[model samples]
Target: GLMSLDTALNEMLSRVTPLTAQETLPLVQCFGRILASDVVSPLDVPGFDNSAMDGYAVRLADIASGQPLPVAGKSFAGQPYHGEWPAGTCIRIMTGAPVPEGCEAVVMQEQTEQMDNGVRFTAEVRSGQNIRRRGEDISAGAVVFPAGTRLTTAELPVIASLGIAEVPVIRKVRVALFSTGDQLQLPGQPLGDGQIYDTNRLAVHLMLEQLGCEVINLGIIRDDPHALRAAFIEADSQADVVISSGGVSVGEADYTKTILEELGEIAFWKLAIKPGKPFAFGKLSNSWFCGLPGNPVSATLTFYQLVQPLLAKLSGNTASGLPARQRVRTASRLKKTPGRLDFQRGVLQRNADGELEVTTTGHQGSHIFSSFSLGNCFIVLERDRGNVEVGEWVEVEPFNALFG
Candidate 1:
């Protein structure tokens, strides 16, 4: 039996995906990388207990109820007191200075009166006051970072604090992209008899860039089996994956599938997803292949749903989180058939109570790219499902918030 989009994706990912061990990369290039191994601290963070205030460090037991004590000596950061302080005497200590010998507490300068030879304080000082204990921030041998953690701005400092000058990270995968169609023409060129400017390449290029791939644009390939085969050969030598749009579906002039069958292994030909039913995946000379439908919306949807995870695997990333799902109440009714799963572009908004609600963006045709221009999410109606009534709960995948 044929598989739905959900089932097919789950099955393909489990069988073909792999998480290769990460390689060492310089810290400057590790900005958006994921941690492949746990990082442990080797030394105490502060290294020693020091003063937290710029005042006198004295033994707590020697502090008379409200009496003055002789000032023995001064201690600044990086210059600790060399001699021990006599009993009933205090040391004037700067912030971050090691506590003087025979001292357990510090009295703030604001709470004491400075005399010519001593200081007077009214507050009763407690033991261990204003002291930064060694290893307070991080302990030796503590695991500071774990595997499968994505590097963020906040995580960079943690790595540096652990004395890690370099880290193991996933390498960026190279993706070769091309479009094929006789009716498609490049921009800036005058339109010939039955030709339109290429729009599918733009969507494919941007999606590949978002997935952190180095995209190699091969321009447009004519609908010729020999030309397509040459392109595949070039791509297999330079890129880890190859993606093409157009000329894969069943057509008299479709050269993509024919050349692939001659030179590569076809894993799966078609899926049960509306607007992207003609998706294809396979391998060619050790390089992975993904064939997307030529339609503008279909190319974008298929890339996100099918190719993103495969690219992540080839880049050595270990864990690829499942696509996020949200529950929303349908604002209008929708009708569907039982054979295909439909992803209709819809607008989602927060209701008064802060719950997400969705409404269809008018016509749900794959050719109607205008409907998706203003849409924020795709309402996914599963296969074998029936008509949906207004106010019914549905699942939605949101568009990129950075651009919307």
Candidate 2:
């Protein structure tokens, strides 16, 4: 039976539970991990009032005399002037230096001219100008990052600025992966008759690691029913999810369905999606199961569309794993059938008018893995969508960082 994309996703997500195991790790090793707890700020950013320009710190009344004020004392970063300031005097302050107490404004070096006695200001000075106040950027005792935030380069530096050296993060999701085919061989090996290099396992492995999953790779298994059953049992015992790359589709040598039926209540689903129709999902006694299609593009697409969200939920990651889709005009004619949702690879770019447009990457065959390399986005046509002409509006989903 066929399952709609949204219906299948809801079914999977509704049945799975997020992992509860957590650990504390230093910020250096926390990249790509999800937070298990909220990170509350311990101290205010900047910690103190400081100068934002390399020039002079002055009192508003002192600069009203229109005369160059004599230099009182110098204040460099980590050094503040402690001397008593008389009326008509300014303090020389460098950028990021602590502004002396009782000083009102800081004048940028570009707005002032150096005088024989001190510094002369030419621009009108406003109160609180160029002064970075304490707690201005981030306040103390505020929640920096809430629980379930995925740690990435964009977030790590912001956390580092808070002086937090360590963080509590959720444990990585453990995935047991394998491929099954009698005619598949490892790369760099001489192929026998009817043998080809296995690409799905490698591609899936790379994507698993990139998504922060700890993958336990069980190498390609042959078509024997006994071997397939053993692999399923072993994988279910050790992983949160077991992913098999072949045998989901119907074939004489396909023993995955038989073994999966024996070991668990797995569903053989024909998804309403192109380049990826055959997929299997259900639960074994100890773990979840996902079987992808055998073709490279099909396997990768199914994994990207289905398995990515599954792992994110299992890891307690609150982020929606995929980027949002955008509607734009198509620059090339597209071929699509109405029975399945089409994820045609396309190049997305801005046109001369600065509007976003997408063009198909030639052929969108399930075996053409090169389409992923040639295009940056998926031109998503609806399940009932048919052939598209140039200048037609289509939904385009830009590839996430996983494709980066």
Candidate 3:
């Protein structure tokens, strides 16, 4: 009755198309956006030979005279020294300043004694030492980033270094979000009998924004059929994707499934994934829909694992939303069933032996939301794998920026 996680993900990606409209935004405004074009470097990094340290730039032959080299000129980062170099003279240079012509080496201030007459070289000097050559780090016309790269801080600085002022990127995807259930109440309100705070909406909303989607928060919809139908219709009309938490599970009071069937074609799948089993996905008249589970942890996990990739693809990002998985030993014995793929929260760290290992965050039940806060990764147990013993090898997927 349950579809494998791979099958579910593959099907979702195959069904949805990325947003096509693109725009050129200023580099300062391109953070977290996906690029629609390749970013090529216009010129070489450093553009010119420069100093790597605050020291004296000298000609090797002049330094070999065993004499104090008189300072002819100084080269600050902005003001470079290009004056005539008389024999037995050196140029005082700071870090990042362009190296003077015919210079052979740079002696750091620590190795040289500052004499009343001139700077004295006290150590051996090698040719090209403390000099950074042009294009050493990046050459001209190099492809800094291929199309479909996300412009995160890790990548944006590189683009800025290439003197790119603007970038071609896909516009943000619009997401319509809401939570269902008459028993759900907003925070800061006194709890009624059998009612809990609507934690999923806030958690899901925060995650949606973190993924860079333009969220249209429809808030919490009551269990009534009329209200549910209206919310779905409005959400579908106004957004590229409609995400409704709760009501995908089999519950008599849930009108979400009934209304969704009437307004759009959807698949209610029992996925072989822990903490997130009941999920819904399909197409409405104007947008796609993803129904997340009601439980807080379950809802957040489903959003991270499933909806995250879906949004990435829809936003024209060809990169995978999930991080790479690594095989490591588990420090705690883990309980699991043989049917579903488990994503137990874990703390990944280096052991005394310098080997990577992961330990559980204690009870992994779907409702224990604290597990996410205490852990940095998902200790992924296989579908057919049962209980795990301590020190057994298992796969661990570290949390991405969303958790940070």
Candidate 4:
């Protein structure tokens, strides 16, 4: 059977075992870090039965009598009321304060009319009303966040509330990055004849960093085999994974695959992906190797679709992913080919009819970097699909990294 995209991804993920080495970090600085183990709550949140609102804690029978109930005491948070609350009396309870003994329910203070003797309310009350039971939010010994779960800014408070002072986390992935081809030069350098500035090097480096990898840029390597082999050896020595761009396709100068074959194993190559079909996946010594396409758009898409998930696995984060797209109408006709998945640059908008409509940013060439800058999303046409007519439905996922 032919392999699908998910199958290919899961297969690659099975190759690299997650790093077993983990380190503990202070909870105050654990924001955006992935947990290495399950964290169980030390104690129940809101450790005692407490009032959910500012009200009078009274017995249900007291309100049925239609007579004023005397305020026996006041219960405030931190300094709770410990005095006796007799059957015919009530306690003025503040929100987050523990419910007093002999109080079956609480009635909002605004509903009660304060008289010279006590307080009065026209409505009857129910048992357990306005009461937050102990362990209602979180139970003692319950796992708040499981292992492999990535922490977000908002999730910090949840862990903090459980009194977790520190957490064990897998170390960040170390990525060795480089770009190939003798026709390429770094930025700020004078471009010689038949030479272009290095775009994939910076692009892949930043992308890996954004995905939480510690990047070791090896810079642009020339087309010589000796230089390439030496770079591969150096890359494997320091990084967990090595990412290289260019010379992965049917170029005469393509020596990356040749040198990698002599050094390590090239497990697979040439996925059924448009503009990025010539990509390579292998291992250089003990380090994982991902070879991206030379085109700007192809390199970016392949990195996002493939390497991003790989890094997540290395970091022990299971919840990393881009949001799914809805089927929306395209304003113009689409150009596409079958048997290879196409990720086209698109400019999306919500029309006056409250319907989603998208258009291609510019020319759809993989070399056009402007598509990434001008477009907000990728108009994903299926591998088996062809040219789409105007108003046809297609799935489009936003550029979450560059929501700009």
Candidate 5:
């Protein structure tokens, strides 16, 4: 037996989801990438015990309540002290320099006065103060980073401090994007009667880009079967996945479905979702295909809800589900007569308790993109759902932090 689009999508994901495996890439190129494996420190990060301040390094026991310690030698970073210091002797050690053989702490340069023969400490000295202990930041054989962690700017230095020149990361996916409709014109063109600018292409394209896809934009394809077929062939030849909006619904001029059937298999179509009911998914030759609804808002929702997860899987990302929903109190009741799942665009605000409270942007038409511009989350209402009451908690999918 077959399943509903929701069930089918969940089933397909369970069967075909891919996991990111470890891939070795150079350290300079690992920024903003996710770590696929744990990194261990090979040796102490600083390599040796060193001074943390640009002052004198002296033994705390050698200093009395107020005493002038004789400067034995000057030691800077990358230089070593040649002789051991006698009692009451201090070494003028700059920041990052190895502490002298008998030194236990560093006094800041500003806290001491430089005499002709030695330095005098004005304040009390503490032992092991301003000294970077060897392996303090990271010890040898310690795990530097865990797997599935995204690399940030701070993480790069930690790996580099371990002397790691290369790191493991998951590769990004390649996506081909386009739009189709004889009534659709490019943004800069002069508009004729019954023709609207192609907003779906830009919306879907930007969404894919934000999801970290390598996009191949094929521009707009006409409603002609020959042109559509050519575009699909080009897309399949160049990318791992091909995504197009428009011309997939039950219309005589909707050549995308017909071309797909002629070239490959139609996995499923006509999902049980509002705004985007006429969604289609299939395979064309070697590439996977996602055919989104033509309406601007519908295309955006379909891309975010359905295509985003699928692309994430193909891209080797681990978190491949629809973004987790948080319970948000409704600011106002919502009216609906739904047999299909609805993803109504809504504005979510922080209440006094810092909890998310949501209110719908009026006019829930599929072609209205203005509502989406003002909203930061979607209020999800399930199939056969009725009107919601104010103050009731509903599932809200926030725009920020898609992955927890």
Candidate 6:
């Protein structure tokens, strides 16, 4: 029986361990780095009660009768109102200014009327409204972020705003990659009949590099038994993981299985995923091995969904590394069959009513580059899910990986 995606993922994850080495980096340079330890807050955010808006901090008791309360003093951030407001008075407070003692609420200046006696209001004031209480946003000794959480643009700001200057992170994973295909040609070279540019290798190198992996490209090798055997032997000896883009599956052109089996060991190939069923995972002596499909889309999807998770685990990521998925309703009907987990490319957008909408990029062919070039997300169909009718919802994984 073909291996299920879940079982394959669980097995790979169980067999891999994260890098043990750690390094400390300043908050300024920690973007896209993985945290090595839990980040705990040293002090409560908003150390003191503060105003959420620029308005008057008033005691509702004096304004309960609509009695005219004279303004006492003005308070701005860093400039305290020294003494507390005694009676029949209010302090003009700017946004972020610490609320003075005995101030029950803040009234927006727009609510001020010419006849405004007391702390004026166009509407009834709720107690403690418009005031940010101390420790409301974050508390002292709280865990701000867990270990293995990747730092991003938004996350960096949160840590910096908390006055964290340095953080501990894991070292990057070193992946050795290569390709094998007799009909393959590089870009800028003249193409003969049935020749194709080796696009998968380039795409995968970038994807790995972008995910903070240290990629060692062994270049392209022609489909020959001697070359395949020698390449795998050296690649496995030098890297934590050896990845090849082709020379897999049960075809006469494939010698990778024979070469690997002769020099190393082959785990299972042929999963129950479309465009990726020909994928293979195994071990070469001390190094891990991954043999991906040849079709551009198939290679890309397999690398992203299967190889990425395995690499993440090896690189010290202690959390889910798959693309974050969100539910989006399809704009039109979708054609599908009940078998593999289909990762059809699509364009995700917001409609006039501000709801999430998605539609396929084009024909669902593995060799079509435009399927992804014209789209931004993967419209995921489950293994047993049949053809989708118009307006049906499916899981859409947007092109965001800063957090993975």
Q: State each model's C-alpha RMSD to the native.
A: 4.1, 2.5, 3.5, 2.3, 4.9, 4.3
Candidate 4, poorest ten consecutive residues by summed lDDT: 247-256
404: Cα error in model 5, Å:
18
Per residue, candidate 2 scores C-alpha lDDT tens digits across 1-404 of 46888888899999999997999998989998999999998988889899998989899998989988889899997778987888899989999998988989999889888899877898689899999999988899998889999998988888888888888999999999998877999987899999988888998899999888999999998778888888888999999999987644422234566677778887877889988887888989999999888888988999999999999999998987778998999999999889898899999999999999999888888757788888999999999988999989999999987776
lDDT of residue 16 for candidate 2: 93
Q: Pick the candidate with the highest TM-score.
A: 4
Greater lDDT among 1 and 3 belongs to 3
**Candidate achieving higher lDDT, 3 or 6:** 3
State the lDDT of candidate 4 residue by residue for 1-404, as single tens digits: 33456666887788878776788998776765778889889998879999988989988788888889899899997998886667778889899898986668888888899987889985678778899888988899988889888877777778888777778988788999888787898788898999888887887877776777789997877778888888888999998998886654322335555676777777555667776765677777779888777777777788888888888788888875665787889997888988888888899998899888999887898656788888898898898999999879989988876346
lDDT of 3 by residue, 1-404 (tens): 67998898999999999997899999889988999988888999889899989989999888888888889989888889877788899999999998988888898899989888887887679888999899988889888798888888899988888878899999899999988776888888888999898888888888889889899998887768888888888988889999986644423334555777889888888899998788888899999999887888888888888899999999988778778899999999999999999989999989998999999998998757888889999998999999999989999999987786
lDDT of 6 at 333: 79
Give the alpha-carbon lDDT of every model: 0.77, 0.88, 0.87, 0.80, 0.75, 0.80
Candidate 1 lDDT over 190-308, as tens digits, reads 89998987887777787777666789999998878788788899988888888886555422334555677776776654677777776777778867788877777887777777787
Clashes of each: 0, 0, 0, 0, 0, 1
After TM-score superposition, the amount by which residue 14's alpha carbon in candidate 6 deviates from its true location, in angstroms, is: 3.0
* Poorest lDDT segment (10 consecutive residues) of candidate 1: 246-255
Error of 4 at 37 (Å): 0.3
| Better-scoring candidate (lDDT), 2 or 6 | 2
Error in Å for residue 331 of model 6: 7.1
Clash pairs, candidate 5, are none
TM-score: model 2 vs. ground truth:
0.91
Give the TM-score ranking, best first: 4, 2, 3, 1, 6, 5
- Give the C-alpha miss distance for residue 382 in model 5, angstroms: 4.6
Task: Output the better candidate (3/6) by TM-score.
Answer: 3
